[PDB]
């Protein structure tokens, strides 16, 4: 028995139940910002404002700027990120999420600007293929812990094929201090920085930027953003 675990196969007893329990968990969550953020709705603006600053460097600076035609919000829920981060920056946004009721609520939550959400894909990321040469930005936030290592590596590889020229993938998510930790309540994992780095490398992706989110509640996991292509 090792000092700690470092991959999902060490903490997930039954992959089918890992996914089915997670789907059941999200079906029971209110379709609200505080539901998306597990009781942390009060820090949504802190999150979004840092994400905007992080992303704007790729859209506004450099000789090979990331485009603003189309973004994909992965694990989008009701569209908290689509509303305040993506729709103001991209002409069109697509959303993908496993929970249909969140995509339904999105149509109300997003309001008039939600008319620029094109596709509402109801699908688990582990079964989702983003269209080749389709997105300038693929935003993956607070959902990677719901995929096994093999599914996450393969999903990221499919995302890479989906990027337009100069496009990027952004992962923004919880990072454990060490190892891989199972949350048996929502049926998710939290991985350390080295594990995530290994998975990113295995998908064929290169790291463009890495940033720890400042100003978050003291008691929560650290949150990191990775820009990849």
């Amino acid at each position: 028995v090792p000092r700690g675990s470092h991959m999902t196969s060490e903490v997930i007893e039954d992959e089918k139940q890992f996914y089915s329990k997670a789907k059941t968990y999200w079906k029971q969550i209110p379709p609200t910002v505080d539901g998306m953020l597990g009781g942390y709705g009060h820090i949504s603006s802190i999150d979004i404002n840092s994400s905007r600053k992080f992303l704007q460097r790729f859209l506004r600076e450099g000789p090979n700027k990331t485009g603003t035609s189309c973004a994909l919000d992965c694990g989008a829920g009701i569209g908290r990120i689509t509303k305040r981060l993506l729709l103001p920056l991209f002409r069109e946004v697509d959303m993908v999420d496993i929970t249909e009721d969140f995509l339904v609520q999105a149509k109300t939550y997003l309001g008039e600007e939600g008319k620029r959400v094109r596709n509402y894909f109801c699908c688990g990321l582990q079964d989702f293929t983003p269209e080749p040469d389709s997105y300038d930005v693929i935003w993956i936030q607070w959902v990677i812990g719901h995929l096994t290592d093999q599914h996450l590596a393969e999903f990221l590889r499919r995302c890479k094929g989906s990027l337009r020229p100069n496009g990027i993938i952004v992962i923004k998510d919880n990072m454990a201090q060490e190892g891989v930790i199972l949350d048996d309540v929502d049926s998710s994992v939290c991985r350390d920085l080295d594990v995530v780095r290994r998975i990113i490398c295995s998908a064929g992706l290169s790291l463009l930027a890495e940033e720890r989110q400042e100003n978050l509640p003291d008691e929560i996991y650290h949150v990191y953003s990775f820009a990849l292509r």
């Binding site: 953020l37 597990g38 942390y40 820090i43 201090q177 930790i181 949350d183 008691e219 929560i220």
Partner: peptide, 6 residues
């Protein structure tokens, strides 16, 4: 989303 550390 955000989660209290284990």
């Amino acid at each position: 989303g955000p989660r209290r550390r284990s």
